[PDB]
Amino acid sequence: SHHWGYGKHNGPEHWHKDFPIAKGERQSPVDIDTHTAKYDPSLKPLSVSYDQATSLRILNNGHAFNVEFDDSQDKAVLKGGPLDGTYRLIQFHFHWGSLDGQGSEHTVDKKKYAAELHLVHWNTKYGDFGKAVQQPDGLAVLGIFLKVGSAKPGLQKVVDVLDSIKTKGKSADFTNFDPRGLLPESLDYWTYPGSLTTPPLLECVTWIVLKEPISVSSEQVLKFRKLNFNGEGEPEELMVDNWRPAQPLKNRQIKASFK
Amino acid sequence: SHHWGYGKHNGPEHWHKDFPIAKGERQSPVDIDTHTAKYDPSLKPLSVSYDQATSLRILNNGHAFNVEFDDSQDKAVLKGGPLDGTYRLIQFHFHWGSLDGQGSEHTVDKKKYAAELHLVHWNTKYGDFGKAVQQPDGLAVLGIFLKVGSAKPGLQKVVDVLDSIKTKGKSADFTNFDPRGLLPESLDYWTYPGSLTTPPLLECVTWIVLKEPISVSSEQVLKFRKLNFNGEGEPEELMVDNWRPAQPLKNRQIKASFK
Ligand SMILES: [Zn+2]
Ligand SMILES: [Zn+2]
Numbered sequence: 001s002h003h004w005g006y007g008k009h010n011g012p013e014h015w016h017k018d019f020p021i022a023k024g025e026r027q028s029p030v031d032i033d034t035h036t037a038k039y040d041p042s043l044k045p046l047s048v049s050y051d052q053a054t055s056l057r058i059l060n061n062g063h064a065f066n067v068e069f070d071d072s073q074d075k076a077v078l079k080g081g082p083l084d085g086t087y088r089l090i091q092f093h094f095h096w097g098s099l100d101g102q103g104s105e106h107t108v109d110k111k112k113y114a115a116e117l118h119l120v121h122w123n124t125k126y127g128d129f130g131k132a133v134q135q136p137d138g139l140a141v142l143g144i145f146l147k148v149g150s151a152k153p154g155l156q157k158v159v160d161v162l163d164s165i166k167t168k169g170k171s172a173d174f175t176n177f178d179p180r181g182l183l184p185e186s187l188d189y190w191t192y193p194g195s196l197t198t199p200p201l202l203e204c205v206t207w208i209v210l211k212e213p214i215s216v217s218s219e220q221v222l223k224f225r226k227l228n229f230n231g232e233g234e235p236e237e238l239m240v241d242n243w244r245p246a247q248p249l250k251n252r253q254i255k256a257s258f259k
Numbered sequence: 260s261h262h263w264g265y266g267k268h269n270g271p272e273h274w275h276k277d278f279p280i281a282k283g284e285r286q287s288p289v290d291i292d293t294h295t296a297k298y299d300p301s302l303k304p305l306s307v308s309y310d311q312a313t314s315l316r317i318l319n320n321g322h323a324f325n326v327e328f329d330d331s332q333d334k335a336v337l338k339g340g341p342l343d344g345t346y347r348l349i350q351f352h353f354h355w356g357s358l359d360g361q362g363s364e365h366t367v368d369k370k371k372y373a374a375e376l377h378l379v380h381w382n383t384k385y386g387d388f389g390k391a392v393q394q395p396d397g398l399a400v401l402g403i404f405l406k407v408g409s410a411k412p413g414l415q416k417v418v419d420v421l422d423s424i425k426t427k428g429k430s431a432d433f434t435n436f437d438p439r440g441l442l443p444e445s446l447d448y449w450t451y452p453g454s455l456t457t458p459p460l461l462e463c464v465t466w467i468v469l470k471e472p473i474s475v476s477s478e479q480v481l482k483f484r485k486l487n488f489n490g491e492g493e494p495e496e497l498m499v500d501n502w503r504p505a506q507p508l509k510n511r512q513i514k515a516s517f518k
Contacts, residue, residue, distance in 0.1 A: 020390065
């Protein structure tokens with residue numbers, strides 16, 4: 001049976017065995033070197049339209065936890081920036097560390113943050129997510145760093161339900177969550193063409209990584225670390241360090257929306 | 260639920276809705292125009308090594324029937340011709356018509372044959388079939404036309420078990436079958452880069468189409484037409500005309516191994 005994770009035997013260094021695209025030309029995440037990621041004046045402002053977002057459920061999938069949204073209409077969309085057309089929010093999730101000093105997938109001048117939020121969107125041109133993931137312009141992932149600091153009020157609804165989804169396969173109803181409460185005030189960003197950061201590592205993502213982190217409390221992120229990778233009745237494996245390290249940039253350009 | 264077939268609503272003209280590669284650059288089958296499919300003196304002879312082929316089962320999958328082989332070792336392999344490396348036989352199946360005058364997928368100067376046999380092989384470089392289908396050179400399909408004429412003795416073992424797999428999902432044990440009994444005397448061929456001829460229509464196939472048809476009797480092909488596309492208990496839909504028509508060659512070259 002096929003399995004993957006973040007452990008010694010099944011972790012990122014081994015993903016290439018079952019998923020040879022892991023050594024591909026457009027893999028994510030990457031380190032963002034601010035000396036070489038140049039301002040591009042042709043980049044437009046990002047348009048985030050989340051005012052009508054409709055969350056449905058929250059699920060522990062054994063790798064992270066996803067908050068899933070109704071993506072049957074343009075209720076929560078990303079437009080503008082480097083994108084053509086309309087990208088619908090389907091889910092968000094996080095990657096995080098075992099310690100406050102690590103957890104993010106993207107890094108900025110090699111700096112790691114405590115966690116990283118991924119808001120995952122698919123291009124409506126392709127009809128559904130399953131077709132979109134097969135296209136180079138299929139997905140747009142908005143990535144937001146989490147820096148340990150003040151508590152984030154808009155995260156607390158998430159933190160408060162995590163005890164109900166401790167183990168793999170558990171889910172809960174999760175309505176009326178406002179994803180606007182997870183955004184920073186500035187939407188200045190970096191963008192590059194990349195991939196899913198988990199198997200199957202498909203190269204279908206326009207990455208949009210925000211410059212400004214959001215602040216999370218030490219206690220809020222500690223709650224994330226109480227989750228389990230494993231199923232109920234299996235040996236405890238705490239859900240920590242579920243991040244893939246920076247991959248080679250290869251021929252790619254990272255463009256900045258800001259000076 | 261996702262479905263496809265050969266009917267009015269779900270047939271080849273509609274496959275593009277769920278499988279947009281249907282309109283791609285390397286789709287199969289094609290018409291082989293013998294005035295433009297030029298002899299290539301750099302093409303090697305085809306090496307067919309089926310003396311140790313180990314058949315396992317025969318299955319009605321609701322689209323055709325497959326004879327499946329044990330592909331754990333190099334027991335039945337295709338080498339040479341246009342191929343680099345070793346391609347293991349995994350299964351064979353046929354496409355056929357409702358009438359003797361149609362049924363083949365490839366055509367030769369627009370001529371249709373009563374049926375076409377596909378012997379499906381995967382490139383061992385890629386580890387298993389599931390990874391091979393993700394690569395442009397992942398599969399090699401040896402295609403053999405069936406012309407109505409004398410009975411083919413080597414086909415009779417197949418014909419004799421079809422009553423046991425009439426409907427979708429039925430299978431039977433099917434051991435010691437000799438696929439050499441389905442080959443013509445000459446291995447002269449045409450070759451071109453193409454696709455699966457059924458959804459998901461992946462562009463992963465080196466096609467090797469033999470010049471010389473095999474015969475089959477009018478009664479043998481009539482037996483194929485008694486199979487059902489449908490499952491047990493569903494309305495009868497006879498398994499006939501399970502062929503995709505010729506697709507545009509676009510800028511591809513069809514090379515002949517013979518003058
Ligand atoms: Zn992610
Ligand atoms: Zn076929």
